[PDB]
Structures are given as C-alpha cells and as structure tokens.
Amino acid sequence: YFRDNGKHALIIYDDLSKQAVAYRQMSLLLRRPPGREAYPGDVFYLHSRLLERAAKMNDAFGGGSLTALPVIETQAGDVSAYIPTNVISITDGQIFLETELFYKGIRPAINVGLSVSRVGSAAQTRAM
Amino acid sequence: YFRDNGKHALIIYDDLSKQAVAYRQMSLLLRRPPGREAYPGDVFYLHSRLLERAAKMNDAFGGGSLTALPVIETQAGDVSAYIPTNVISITDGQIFLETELFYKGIRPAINVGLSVSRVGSAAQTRAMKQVAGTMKLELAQYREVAAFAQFGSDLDAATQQLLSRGVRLTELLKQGQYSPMAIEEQVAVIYAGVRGYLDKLEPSKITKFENAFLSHVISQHQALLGKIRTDGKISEESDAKLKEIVTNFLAGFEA
Amino acid sequence: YFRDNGKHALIIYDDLSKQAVAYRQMSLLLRRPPGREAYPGDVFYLHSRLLERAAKMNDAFGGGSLTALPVIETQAGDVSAYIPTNVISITDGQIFLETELFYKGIRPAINVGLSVSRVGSAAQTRAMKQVAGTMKLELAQYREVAAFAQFGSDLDAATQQLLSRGVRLTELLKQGQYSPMAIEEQVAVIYAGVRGYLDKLEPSKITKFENAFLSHVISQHQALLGKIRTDGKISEESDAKLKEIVTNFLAGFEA
Amino acid sequence: XAXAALXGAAXAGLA
Amino acid sequence: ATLKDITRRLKSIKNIQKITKSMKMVAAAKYARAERELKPARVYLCGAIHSSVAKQMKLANIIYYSLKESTTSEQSARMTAMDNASKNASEMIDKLTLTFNRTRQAVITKELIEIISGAAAL
Amino acid sequence: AGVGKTVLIMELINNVAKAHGGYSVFAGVGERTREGNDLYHEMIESGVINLKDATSKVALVYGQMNEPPGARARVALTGLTVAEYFRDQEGQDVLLFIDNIFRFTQAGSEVSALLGRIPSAVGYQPTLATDMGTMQERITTTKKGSITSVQAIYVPADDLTDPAPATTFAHLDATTVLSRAIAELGIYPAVDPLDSTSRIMDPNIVGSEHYDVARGVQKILQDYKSLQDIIAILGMDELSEEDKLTVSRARKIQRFLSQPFQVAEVFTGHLGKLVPLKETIKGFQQILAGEYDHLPEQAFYMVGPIEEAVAKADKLAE
Amino acid sequence: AGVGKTVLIMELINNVAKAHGGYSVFAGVGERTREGNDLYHEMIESGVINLKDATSKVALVYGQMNEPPGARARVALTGLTVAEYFRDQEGQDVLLFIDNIFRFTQAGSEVSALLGRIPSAVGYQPTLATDMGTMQERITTTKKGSITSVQAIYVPADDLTDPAPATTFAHLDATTVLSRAIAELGIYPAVDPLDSTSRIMDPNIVGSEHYDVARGVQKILQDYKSLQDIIAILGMDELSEEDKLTVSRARKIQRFLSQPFQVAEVFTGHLGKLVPLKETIKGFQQILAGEYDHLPEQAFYMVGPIEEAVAKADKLA
Amino acid sequence: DPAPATTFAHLDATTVLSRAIAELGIYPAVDPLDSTSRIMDPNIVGSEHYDVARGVQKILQDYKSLQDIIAILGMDELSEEDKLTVSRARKIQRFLSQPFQVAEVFTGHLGKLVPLKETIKGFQQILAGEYDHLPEQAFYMVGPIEEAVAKADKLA
Ligand SMILES: Nc1ncnc2c1ncn2[C@@H]1O[C@H](COP(=O)(O)OP(=O)(O)O)[C@@H](O)[C@H]1O
Ligand SMILES: [Mg+2]
C-alpha cells in the first residue's frame, strides 16, 4: 500500500522458518507428497514469491518502496543448510549472527566474512 | 505371578536391543512410518510398558516384587543412540561394561564412574555401607590421576597414595564367573583393601591374597562371618576381630 | 563377435554411472520399488549381467577374449556409495584417480596404493616383472615414510634413502597423454630409476631425463629394445649394455 | 573417509 | 557436522598424528646420543623447557655444561611430548571415524526415508 | 548462494559481450527481478540496447523468481529458442547468457510430485538427467553457427555433489568453480584454482608457456594446501627453507589471483581492472620465478597487472 | 588376495577329511564366474577334487554374480542343505564355506526391495536379522553330528558397526584374519596371531594349559611388538638380558607359527604338515619355556612339530 | 530433534543440561553457554549482575576455543596469558557446580542454597583474579565462595 503510493515501508518477517513449517503442515494434510526434508517441493517458491514483492518503484510508479528483513533460524550455526540456502538465494544479502561471537563479546554477533549486501555502497551515503 | 503373591522374582531381558529390531521388522512390514534409525514411533513405549511392570509392592499388596535386569547392546560404546537412550530413560540406573576395561583385563569390565543405581542405596546393607562407602570415595580420588598416559612420572605423596589404593581396590573388584560371593564375604575382602591392609602390598598379589585370605576366613572363621551376616552390620567387636584377622593373615602371607 | 571367433576385443563403458541413472529413471517411472539412492532392487544385477560377459575363452572355444574397462564416477571420493560399490565388487580390480594427486603434479592421477589388479603378474610380461616387482616394493616402502619428508629435520640415512628412491620412482610414473609406450620402452626407463641411476639426479629433472633418454634408445638402440622385447626379459647381457647406455647418457646429461 | 574401503578389513582384529 | 567437515579434520588429524609420531622417533635418537655424551660432561615443541627457564629467569667450562645438559633435557622433553601428541591424535582419529560412520549411515537412512515418504503419498 | 556467479557473469558481459559483433541473448531463469531491471537499464545506458533505433545487439528473455514453477520450467527454452535463430537462420555467431540454469531443474522438481512420480535421490525428479540432456543438447555450436554460452549454475547447500550441479558438469567445455571458503577470505573472484577446468588447457592449444605456468601455479597452491593444516598445529619453524618459500609464494599467488572487477566497485571500493592474457602469464611466471620474494603479500591483493603490485608495495612501504 | 585365502581354504578341507573323515561344501554366494572356474581347477590340481575317481572331498555350489537376486539369495541355503546331509544322514563333521557372507545379505536386500518392502536403517532389509538367523542357526552341533562354517566377510565402508557386518558378528565364534603383512615376512599361512580371535579361548573351555600357552604366545608377541619401534630407531642394544630373550623367543615363535600345507605340495616341493593339538601346545610351551633358546631362528621356519625344529637345526649345522 | 527444537520458542528461560558436563562430574550439568533467559537484561538484573554474567560466559567461550589445541598438545605450548584464562575458566567451571539437597545421596555432600548477591560476588572475585592462588578442586562442589577458600585450606 505504502510502496505503490510513493511512500516507504519496511517489513520484518519474523520468522520464515516457522512459516515454512506451517506450510509443510498445511501441505501434507492436503496429502501433497512430501519433498526434500519433508517440505513441499515448492518451499523455495513459497519464499521467493513473497520476498520478490519487496521492491523499489521508479518515479513513474511513485518512487515508493518496500524493504524486507526476513528472519531465518539455523541449527548448529549451519548456514549451508537447505532452507537457509534456499532463502539466502533470494534476498539481496544476509546478516549472519554466530553464538560464538556473541559469547565472545562480539555483539552484534555479526560474522563479517559470511555476511553480504548485494547492494553495496549504492545504498550508503557518501560520508559512509 | 510371584510379584503378585507376596513372593519375589527376577526377570532378565536378554536383549531388549534384538527385541526392538524384531518389533521394527514388524513395524516396517506393516508399513508404519520409520523414524529415527528407521524405528517406529512407539519403540520407546515398547520398552516403557514392559519395564514399568517391574515393581515393589507394599504390605497391603503382598510386599512382593519384580526386579528387571534388561540387557541393551551398544555399538562402539555409543551410549547416545536412540535405543540406548530410550532404555536409560526408563530404568532406575545402568551398569555400563567397558570394552577397554574388559581387554585391559578388568572384569567385570564395570565403568565405576558412568554406572548408576538411582534407587538402590536404601536397599543396601549397612555392612557394605560400612566398607563400600569409602570405596568409591577412594576410587574417586583415583579416577583422576589414573590417566590414559602410560608413561608418567609423578610427584606428591598424597596423590601418589591415592593412586596406590586405586590399583589395589581395582584388583579387589575383579571376579571370575560362576563364583558369586556371600555379602559377608564381600564386606570382608573389601574391608582389607579399604582399611589399608593391602597398601604395603603389590598389585599383582591382590588376586592371590583374596582367594587365600578368603578361604582362610571361610574355613576358620565362620563365626565372625555369621555375625556380620546375621547382625547385618559391623559391630565394634566384629570390626575389632576382623582387623586382627587381616593383621595376622597378612603377617603370614607368603609373597 | 570378436571374442567368440578366436579374436581379442577391448571394451570401454563410459560411464556405468550414467547408465545406472538411465535405468533408475525407467524403474521409478514404471513405479517399481525404490531402494537406497532410489535405485531398483535389480541395479546390481544390471551390471553383473553386463560385466560377466567379458572373459577369456579356452582354445576349445577359440582362445578369443573380451576385456572390459568400465568407468564409474564417484562423488567426493565416496567409493562406498551405491553404484560404485556394486561395480567395484564385480570387477577384478580398480584404478583409483585422485584430484589431489592430479593437482599435485601426478598425471595420470593414479593412486597407486589404492589401485588393484586381482589378475596381477599373471598378466605381466617377464620383462616387466623383472622390474615392476622391485618398483612396487620401494614405492610401498616410500608410502610408509612419505609423510615424514616435509618435517624430516633429522632422519637417518636409512629411511632418507627410501625418501629419495620414492620421489624418483614417483617421477618415473608420470606421463603425458596420447603417448602410450611399448612394453620394452617402459622397462628401459623403469630400469633406470629402479637400478638407482637417477638417485643422484635432481627430482626436477627426471621428467626431462626420461624423455631424452628414451628418445636416444628409440633412436640409437633399437636393437637392445628389440632384444628386450624378443627375449621377453632383461638378459645378463642387455643388462650390461643398459648400464653403459645410462651411465654414459647420464654423464652427458649433467654436463 | 570417502575411499577408506580400498585399505580394507583394516580394524578386523576388533570384531 | 558434515561428512565434508569431518573429512577435513580426519584428513588433517591423520597427518598431525604421523608427523608427531615421526618427531618422537627423532627426539629419541638425539636423546640416545645425548645420554652418552652426557656421561662425561657431568664430571666437569619441547615440553615445558623454554618456559621453565623463562619464568624463573625473572665461563666456557660451565658454558659447555649448561649446554651439554640443556640438550639432554630438551631432546628428552620433545620426545615424550611428541609421544603424547600422537597418542592424542590417535584417540582423535578413532573418535572421528566413529562420528564419520554414524553420520555416514544416518545420511543414507535419511535419504531413503525421504524417498519412501514421497512414494507412499501418491 | 552469493558467491559471485552473477557478478562474474556481469563482468563477462562487460569484457566480452560489449565488444562482440554478433548478437547476444540473455535469459534470466528463476533469478531476481531487481537484477533484470539493473541489466536492462545498463544495456541501455551503454547502447547495447537501443530504444530509438535498430542498433540493438541484445535480446532479453525473463522468467524470474516471482513466477510459478511452469514459467520457470520453460524460460530457458524461450531464451534458447531465440538464440538458436541467430545461429541457424542467420548464423553470425551468438553469445548466450543464462542465469541461472539450475532454476530450470528446480522448476521441474517443484511440480514433479503433482505429476505423480516417485522421487529420485535428494528429492529430485527421476527424469533430471534426461530433462537436462534434451535441453543442454540444443545449447551448442554447430556448423551453421556458433553459440558461446555462459550459464550460471546454482549449487544447493553448497554441495557440488548435489544431483543438479553434479549432472551439469558433463555438458560443459570449461568450468569456473566459485567457493564460499575462498570468498569468505575476501578473495574475489572467488574462483577455486584447483577445481576449475577447461578443455583447452592443452599445451598443444594454449602453448607450453601458458601451460607450464598454469600447472606451476596449481602445484604450488596444492603444495601449500597440504601444508596448511599441518603448520597450523605444529607451527612453521621445523619447515625447510625450501618449504617456507612455497608457503610464501603461494600466499602471494593466492592474492595475485584476486582482481577488482569493473562491475563490483560498489563492492570492493576499487577501480575495476582488465588484465590481458600476456600480462597474466608473465606476472605469475615471475612470482613463481622468485622475482618478487621481496614485496609483501598485501601488495599482491586486489590489483590488476603485476606492476600494480610493485607500485602498491611502495605505497605500502609507508 | 595375495594372502593364501584359497590355499588355506583347501588345506582345511583336506584336514577335515583326514582328521575327522568329514567332507566339505563350498558355497559361492555372488561368485565372479572367472574366479569360480579358477577355484575349480585349483582344487583339482591340489587333489581335493578328483575327476577320475571318487576321492573328492568337496562339493561345489555356485551362485554366480550374473544370477538374479533370488538365486544369489538362496545358493547359500542350497549349499547348507548339502552339508546338512553329511551330518544328519552320515553324522560326520562337515565344513561349510560361504563366500562371501556379505553377498548373502545384499542378495537379501535386493529381493526385499523387489518385494516392495520398506528398507530399514542403511537401506538393508527390515528382515535383516531374521534372514540371517534362519540361516546361521542351522549351523550347529546336533546330537547326530555338526556343521562348521567358514564365512568370508566383507565389511562395508570399513564400518564394523554397519548393520550388515554388525548383524553377522552376532553369530561368529571366531575370526581368522589373513594378513598381507604377515605374508610379506614370507610367513604362511599368513594368519595374524594377534588379530585373529576365538570365543573358546577360555581356560574353562580349552583348559588351563592350552589357555595359558596361548595367552603366553600372545603376550610375548605383544611385547616384541613394543620393542619393534625401539630396535629400528635407537638400535637393538639397550636391550636387557631380559629384553633380548623376549625378542629371540618371539622371533622363534613367529616362525614356529608358520607351516607347510599338504595342499601346497604339488609345487612347493615341500612336504605338508598336519600338527596335532598336543604337539602344538607342547611346541610353543617349550619355546616359551626356554628349552630351545640355543636353537636358531631359521630352524623353526616352515616345519611341523617341534621335533622338526630340532632336526632342521642339525641340517643347519 | 523436532520435539525439543520446537520447544525453545515457548520458554522465557531455558536450562540446557549436558551429558558431557555431567560426565565431568559437574552437577547440575547445566551448559552455561547454552542456557538463556529473557531476564538477562541490565535493566532487569542490574549491570553488576549483567556484567559478571557476560564476564563468565566470555571466559568460558575463550577457554572453549583453546580446547582444540589443548587436546593434542596440552597446555605447554599455551601463552602465559592463555594459561590464565584456562585456569580461571576451569575454576569458574567448577564454581558453577553445587550440591542439591535432593542429590545428597549421590554427591555425598550437604545441599547448598546460594543467595544471588553471593553468586554475583563469588564470581566477580574469581574473574578478578582474587583466587588465582587456590587450586581448582577447592571450587568444586561448594556453596558460597567462602566455602571454596576453606576447602582450599583443608586441601592444604
Ligand atoms: N567479483 C566480486 N568482487 C567483489 N565482491 C564480489 C564479487 N562477486 C561477488 N561479490 C560479493 O558477493 C555478492 C554476491 O554475488 P552474487 O554475484 O550476487 O552471487 P551469486 O550470484 O553467486 O549468488 C555480491 O553482492 C558482492 O557483495
Ligand atoms: Mg545471482
């Protein structure tokens, strides 16, 4: 609504992990054959479809936007995991937090190496 | 039947491991969803229901009882597997036997640290309480210093001494098959080690001391044993008598 | 057709992995039951029935043969996966290639330690055996010590010797593509290192040496090679001739 | 690991 | 854990174990030499060596002494140290292979269950 | 995910597509919509696309992540179909860019159960390989025309053995393998030097200088890889000076392999460099030759040609 | 391979016919056609098989690798049936060889899968344990006689806890580990004296004597193993009057443990030896004892009973 | 496991017990780096409490990373600085254990109930190097820090 009307919105999906589970549930109960890790073959699509909506409209469309910050819960710090990779492959980067870092006193527990921004400096002020 | 009629039975399930695989076979053939390790969701229950049946009835119900010693076979000492964890979460303790120990020649290869008896202390005899009580304590202080490291030069008299009981006590716990001992016989031999009557002695002699010192008190002293056994405790006299008994026997022991 | 008619034929299956996949696709589509890796219960049979067709006939049948070089593509070196397991289990041996090896400079990337030939020497010429045998032995001996090299801050000259023989022989095993050698040329070269002629040579030069040395003998000495070929072995004579041929060439070489 | 099965019967005296 | 991850450590600890084992054989060798050369001189990663002096730290006739000694003690220390390092590495190779095989198996089962699951839903 | 498949594809369009002289077809299969917009507007700003006249040198086809599996299972065909025309019907040499072909495969997998099929391994459809075959088989150069296809290939869970990436290798002539492990180090492009291959890496084709250098570079990295885990624990002292020089050189090469892309300035904060083949062979040749054992590693990091490494050394000198 | 697997299989056969008048069966589960035929002629050349007379001591059952799962599934049973006869009908002491036990299990899974049943852990058959037990259990000592089985085992992934191997161990009474290394010492049979084990090695079963000797031979063998490392590095000399005897003896022992097989006479040009249990304990007993310390190593290489160790020394000056 | 995994989300405080810790003889076998609480907030427990807590965790985390090395090569090759974290960590590790009334039959010790301020304190000091002289064992199975000092005397 904001995005389409030249306004600016920010949406947090906390978290997409529980949603997938919900999806998997709803799906299995409908008797749709379970896929990899028990999820429906289209879990990727479940998230892509959604996150593609977050966008920056041109001046012709109002110059408004939608920014998304989706949350995913890994297990045993394993980012390579299927769902974690599914989602990493949609978004414009990731902020990866480690518990090791955290306990160590590095808070936020951002893992510089593993985190990225596919927007780069184009999203920063010149000062920054 | 025995538990229900004021009597007392002992049931040995050897093994629950194989039963579980048998049940799993059934389950898969029936087409029930295989889970962790391919086991059906209800394998825990397969075990709980069974094992719940062992029990100690009160007087108003016959005072009878059923004692279960179920057997579980681990792969490569993995005590975390699905089936072993299940069973551990049912019983009232475990006695883990170690491959290492078994080969190193300690048999029963019982892992003193790991093993447990959640409910048995109360069932324990005072006599044993009397000797066994300061045994794990001693063994506790031995558990530490007894490293994997085979070639280690040590210091400190205490820690040295601690290390010294440990090897003796350990020798006292070795036992052959088919020769179950009378509780009073156990307290007796344990007494010798826990009291220090074997400190001055060489770990290779322990076994030999035991047989020799045991036959001795069985032959000559059925008098003191019966007391211990009868009293069910170690009275001042009994203990006094016992002390000399180890004393003299020692004094005459041929290396 | 060849095998049966007193003739000899060689067959390369490239790969059996893809074929297994083709078969799996069909099976599952026909809805047959899937097993490990989704493979039908008769995938083993698919290859065994294939690979058995290769064989050495008896004169009574024509003496003709059919040798098979089936290719299997492992994944992350997992020789124990399903299809690799079958085929390994079906064939008379394996030639194991490694990426580590390859990048390290060993090309072809044959992992000598893990490769095998059940048939063995029963298929080697007397000439080859005459050399292959000791080679196999020093290599195995190097393989035991290899790891030490990079930290051999002070190894005895005993093992230090095997390290040397090791790297040279290893360098001898290297090979360019599209240039298969005659059995007589291979033995001549192998003989060089195996006898110790390249021990003092620089590892960085073995490749160059062989090249040039072999060019020389193929040029100049086509009579000795002819011998070696013919006599099927290394006569005491040709042996001496080789000694001079290499000793002089080497000299020339390090001018 | 991966290609261990080409050793073989290695820990046999343990079985 | 990942078979790829466990394979790394395993790959490495296997190496460390052989190196370490190799270093001891060396340390024993020099130490042999030393015990002999030591004999006469008295009539005149190396364990806790360099540190022991370091902490407590804050001619010729004797120079050759402290030397001729400080090498027996060192070649001694390195030897035992490397002895236990491989002793450690071996406990580890054995331990890791166990995890490897548990996972290895688990992976297979997990896949097969997935297949069966989807097939049975048709 | 996020290792640089796209960026690399971006730099190739720049360093190659731009000076082409024939057509180009870029098919966006199951990728990010944002990207299609970025690319379009870039082609225009650079005249590769011309909205006013017929000078357009590139046709675009899109079937993004916001589409249903059906569209995703087909865009590649659409894009490929366009490209086949310029190959056969006209024939003047075509450049084919697909990003990402994995999406074609994952699209099939998404509807496969609804098609009533027993799943193959890893949840893939049983027809994976063949599906891939009848498709990959069209993406090819013929006697009529020439296609130069650059396909991006997603690697699920980072597992190169995954049925999809695994099945694709055979269809290629050259492979550039990117690695998170390398990326994680800050080395871009994150190419894995010991997992990348090309059918033309043949002395008879690139020549022995190229060949010996390449292999030389690979040996040293392999040599170093082996040592890594070991020095790690046992330390570096016990290492032979012979061995501690390869550790050096390797670390340097490892850096000299990096490069600031023209398309990643927003990322590196460095002006993109384009190195010519001879500048490359030579620079490495030298490092291998011990000709820079004096400069510091850092000097080799994020630079173009070897000279820049030398210059950077001074600048680094203080 | 390389290690005397077939030769050992053939001596056993022979020795069973000899010392027990018992016959043998050979079941090849998933045999490689090439290898079968090679086994055939090998037995023949060694006599165990006789195409001319009626002196054959083995019956051969084959379930080739090309055969379908069901066939390779049953062949072992078939062989079993055969052996059972020499026990249940003629009360002998048969020998059953199953090569290889793994392919049995594998054949089981294939049949299972085909029957559409859901596989269990690691993909094997849900009936893994039963499939095995309904077979293994027929191999025993009844009142009429006894069947003894030599099973060739193939451990998957070198994983001793793999379901296949694991299941199998539940039925084994002893292992016979053939070793390439041993073979390399020229020692044959190439059996590993430290790796090979037996459940019956209990004083309560073999008798204190037998039990002690065994436990003696093994410890010495073990001790020597320790010293092995020292010898090579620091040189064979810090060795005590004691450390030097353990070695000497051990070395004699290692050799005394080797032996000439009658099966391998055809072209070993050496007469075979079928040492008796009594002779076996005695022999080792004495070496341990120190009776032959004066004797030299080579004296004990490839002989039968200790008596031969003595004579060999003679001929060896 | 899906069961426990899905449970975390429903708690305000989580006490994760560890077999590894238990096997070390530490009781309760609580994993100090794995247990959490929404209340662990300076504005709720105070900054003194918040600082000790994070203090203890950081040393235990640090010790954890050193462990891999300690595992092959032991302590020898450790830095004087590193060795100090290890000592402190092993003392904090031990000081975290405690005898329960309910578990008296097993510990062989009289149950203890330590008051919050007592805990904050005893942990501060340990951190603060006020006990680098006492042996580890002194800290094992005790209530308040005071008892850990005594236990030290008794150990002599
Ligand atoms: N060549 C490069 N130079 C610098 N940074 C890069 C480079 N390639 C990738 N990156 C970083 O990686 C991120 C992901 O790259 P991208 O091409 O989007 O990966 P993929 O398409 O493989 O998922 C980029 O947004 C950028 O931050
Ligand atoms: Mg991309």
XYZ file of N, CA, C and O in Angstrom, chain G residues 32 62 134 139 164 181 196 202 248 255 258 268 273:
52
model
N 32.339 -64.561 -8.848
C 32.689 -63.983 -10.138
C 33.021 -65.177 -11.016
O 33.973 -65.884 -10.682
N 27.454 -73.083 -6.661
C 27.728 -71.746 -7.154
C 26.524 -70.882 -7.452
O 25.601 -71.280 -8.148
N 17.628 -67.350 10.327
C 17.011 -68.566 9.846
C 18.010 -69.438 9.110
O 17.767 -70.621 8.869
N 23.470 -74.037 11.392
C 24.854 -74.396 11.515
C 25.220 -74.591 12.978
O 25.514 -73.635 13.695
N 25.014 -54.620 8.306
C 25.380 -55.911 7.729
C 26.406 -56.656 8.569
O 26.127 -57.721 9.118
N 50.616 -58.316 5.374
C 51.883 -58.011 6.006
C 52.633 -59.272 6.384
O 53.801 -59.447 6.044
N 43.627 -62.329 15.001
C 42.692 -63.449 14.951
C 42.225 -63.844 16.344
O 43.044 -63.991 17.247
N 39.114 -69.845 26.288
C 38.837 -69.731 27.691
C 39.368 -70.971 28.386
O 39.107 -72.095 27.950
N 64.228 -62.804 20.936
C 64.712 -64.076 20.416
C 63.595 -65.095 20.319
O 63.305 -65.660 19.261
N 57.920 -67.668 13.815
C 58.263 -68.652 12.811
C 57.607 -69.983 13.104
O 57.006 -70.594 12.218
N 54.370 -70.565 11.623
C 54.235 -70.750 10.174
C 54.194 -72.244 9.854
O 54.522 -73.057 10.719
N 55.684 -76.798 -4.250
C 56.321 -76.095 -3.155
C 57.506 -76.963 -2.870
O 58.451 -76.602 -2.186
N 52.466 -80.576 6.526
C 52.440 -80.929 7.929
C 51.093 -80.662 8.581
O 50.550 -79.563 8.482
